Structure formats: C-alpha cells, structure tokens
C-alpha cells in the first residue's frame, strides 16, 4: 500500500525495512491472488488451499502465519506442471516447509463417518433434484437483502454526515 519515494533505487533489504513498519501478518492482495493461482493450476484434483493447510498443520504442525510462510516459499518454487498424485502434492508441501524451516530457522476413524455422511448428503441432493426444490434459495434472497441494506444504510450514513446528529435526531 505505501509506496516509498524511490522504489526503483532503494535496495531490497532497505525496502523491506520501510514496509515492515506498516504491515503485520497481512498476506496481501497481490500475494493472495498468487497463492490461490498456484493452488488452482498446480495442485492435483481436489487439493485446495484449504486441504494444503490442514496437511501443513496436521503432519508438519504449522499455525496460521507459519503456513503462510510455507505457501510463499512454494510460490517461488511453483511446479511448471500440475502434480499428479495427491502423494506427489503431499511430498511437495514437505520439502517446501523445510526450505521455510531453514529460511526462518526452525526445525521440525472420524474419517469413516466422513465417508458415510458424504453418501447421505448425496442421497439428499438427488432427492431434492427429484423434488425440484431449490435448497439454496434462502441464501439467495438473504444475500440480496443484505446488499440493499448496506445500500440504504449508506445513504443514511451520508445524510448524517451532512446534517449531523443533532439535526437528524
């Protein structure tokens, strides 16, 4: 967000100084676009940015901002092709969290029910289909009202900006 005055000349260690003052744990707009792009085209079918963090945390014990470092190191080492095995994608996340490990300096059944519940969820869907009933219509309408609300709330906010509390009240 904050452009120093000589971006093109002020050296990289000296720019990281200026940027550190104003930023904290923010993965940023441009980096958040780059990590979901790396996850989408390079990760095997089904392997989300969601799944890739639950693996980094389960098998390599990484919290919110520490798995943010492992994703940023994988973004600089992004595969030039999509990984095939989910085990190839797991092995990729492994070596990427150990390149982060020595760049930061730190060393390193309900699932049965999960398979069944999936089944029921589908039995639901197909049934709803037959019934021709829209399960998502609630949230549709809701999201639309939520919009018109910030909209009205907005104009009201403005009128108050112009007239003030005392006058409006």
């Amino acid at each position: 967000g904050t452009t120093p005055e000589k971006p093109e000349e002020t050296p990289l260690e000296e720019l990281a100084e200026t940027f550190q003052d104003t930023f904290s744990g923010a993965l940023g707009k441009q980096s958040s676009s780059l990590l979901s792009r790396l996850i989408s085209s390079k990760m095997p079918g089904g392997f989300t940015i969601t799944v890739a963090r639950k693996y980094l945390q389960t098998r390599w014990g990484l919290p919110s901002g520490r798995q943010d470092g492992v994703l940023l190191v994988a973004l600089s080492n992004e595969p030039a092709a999509r990984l095939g095995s989910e085990a190839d994608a797991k092995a990729f996340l492994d070596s990427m969290a150990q390149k982060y490990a020595s760049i930061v300096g730190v060393d390193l059944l309900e699932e049965i029910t999960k398979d069944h519940k999936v089944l029921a969820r589908q039995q639901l869907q197909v049934l709803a289909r037959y019934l021709k009933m829209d399960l998502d219509n609630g949230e549709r309408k809701f999201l639309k009202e939520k919009d018109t609300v910030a909209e009205l709330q907005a104009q009201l906010d403005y009128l108050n900006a112009e007239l003030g509390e005392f006058f409006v009240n």
Binding site: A16, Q20, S24, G25, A26, L27, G61, L62, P63, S64, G65, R66, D68, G69, L72, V104, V106
Partner: peptide
C-alpha cells in the same frame, strides 16, 4: 508450534 506472522 509458536505461531509467527509473515516477515
């Protein structure tokens, strides 16, 4: 592990 922000 001790949760660190990104640098």
């Amino acid at each position: 592990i001790a949760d660190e922000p990104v640098k």
